[PDB]
Design a protein around this ligand. Structure first.
Ligand SMILES: [Cl-]
Ligand code: NA
Length: 129
């Protein structure tokens, strides 16, 4: 599912991501543009051989099992495939756990490299609040 910007925001707001561990909704919508261009199906390979899955691009080495990543911990007890669905719930439950892992949203390199230090409100400007 390819989301619209405000469509994603409402879905992320309904799941309570807003100020979860102190990150305004804009931080999350911004993470989801640049991680995946708003697409629940995007999958990408990392060098270390791990793959990043879905809307926020949750990684298989720690976070979900894909069966091809040595040493996977499957810290969300989940199949990485289930994070590609159109029902962002599993990706949020897991994202709540990652962000809570101490380094905050810096767990997302596109958040660090592109969202952080910016006016993350442009990402919800025009969303019906
Ligand atoms: Cl933090
Ligand atoms: Na894993």
């Amino acid at each position: 599912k390819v989301f619209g910007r405000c469509e994603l925001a409402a879905a992320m707001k309904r799941h309570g991501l807003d100020n979860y561990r102190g990150y305004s909704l804009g931080n999350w919508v911004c993470a989801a543009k640049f991680e995946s261009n708003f697409n629940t199906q995007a999958t990408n390979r990392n060098t270390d051989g791990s793959t990043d899955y879905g809307i926020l691009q949750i990684n298989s080495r720690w976070w979900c099992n894909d069966g091809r990543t040595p040493g996977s911990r499957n810290l969300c007890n989940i199949p990485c495939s289930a994070l590609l669905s159109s029902d962002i719930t599993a990706s949020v439950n897991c994202a709540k756990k990652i962000v809570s892992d101490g380094n905050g949203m810096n767990a997302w390199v596109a958040w660090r490299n592109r969202c952080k230090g910016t006016d993350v409100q442009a990402w919800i400007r025009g969303c019906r609040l």
